[PDB]
């Protein structure tokens, strides 16, 4: 019954002309609720979920002000990093940041996080104890020494354990109709003959929420991984997700195979078998 809130930020420099492209999105579990795009006309934090549109003007003005201050720090960082790595000003680079908090089943603070990356690789991250830092290289080491003297961890720990948890619980209640509801996967199986002696059985899991799910194939009550295929979980586009697993079997022996579906929206796992 745990839940989380997370913010993702991406900044891409554009040496040819202008400022970096900045995009920020907020999520509660697997539901996006806010976004900001430096390329958009509003230049404001915008709603992406109906339950967040309940917040008044002071909320949106405050979030907009903060996300802008966020983009400016990233703009500065891109330049600072370019120097740390002694890189040319002609190429485009990327800085990413992700932070947030988790609440356990008891709805109390469980864990917090604050990680940073440069060009797609770990740069510096705040440890689980929320007091020490993990620096990937010597560029990150200099950043770490500066953040220790300024006591950045302490400031973050206060937010992650307090403000972050408090707002996560508020959002959870305001959007309880969907956020506190699980959507069990709708399942079925398809059969396709690949030859005169072989056939493919595909097990489908549709319209489920949250995204976390496990699909497994068994043959005569035993797990089978050979001759199977599992696609990565994908968004349906309406807030739910999709997944399927397939196995190639000898024509006429389909009944030996069973598809097992595990999901928190299910009291107990589902077992499907072909007619």
């Amino acid at each position: 019954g745990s839940h989380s809130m997370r913010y993702f930020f991406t900044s891409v420099s554009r040496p040819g002309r202008g400022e970096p492209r900045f995009i920020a999105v907020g999520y509660v579990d697997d539901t996006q609720f806010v976004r900001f795009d430096s390329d958009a006309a509003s230049q404001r934090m915008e709603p992406r979920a109906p339950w967040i549109e309940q917040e008044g003007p002071e909320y949106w003005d405050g979030e907009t002000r903060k996300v802008k201050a966020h983009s400016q720090t990233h703009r500065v960082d891109l330049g600072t990093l370019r120097g740390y790595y002694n890189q040319s000003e002609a190429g485009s680079h990327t800085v990413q940041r992700m932070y947030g908090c988790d609440v356990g089943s008891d709805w109390r603070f469980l864990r917090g996080y604050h990680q940073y990356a440069y060009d797609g690789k770990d740069y510096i991250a705040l440890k689980e104890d929320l007091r020490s830092w993990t620096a990937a290289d010597m560029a990150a080491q200099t950043t770490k020494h500066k953040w220790e003297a300024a006591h950045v961890a302490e400031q973050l720990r206060a937010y992650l354990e307090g403000t972050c948890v408090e707002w996560l619980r508020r959002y959870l209640e305001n959007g309880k109709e969907t956020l506190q509801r699980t959507d069990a996967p709708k399942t079925h199986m398809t059969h396709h003959a690949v030859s005169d002696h072989e056939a493919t059985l595909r097990c489908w899991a549709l319209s489920f929420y949250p995204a976390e799910i496990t699909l497994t194939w068994q043959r005569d009550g035993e797990d089978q991984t050979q001759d199977t295929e599992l696609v990565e979980t994908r968004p349906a586009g309406d807030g739910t997700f999709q997944k399927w697993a397939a196995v190639v079997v000898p024509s006429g022996q389909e009944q030996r195979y069973t598809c097992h579906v595990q999901h928190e929206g299910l009291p107990k796992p589902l077992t499907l078998r072909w007619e």
Partner: peptide, 9 residues
């Protein structure tokens, strides 16, 4: 709700 302060690298 976003964090208020944010230090640079």
């Amino acid at each position: 709700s976003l964090y208020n302060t944010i230090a640079t690298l």
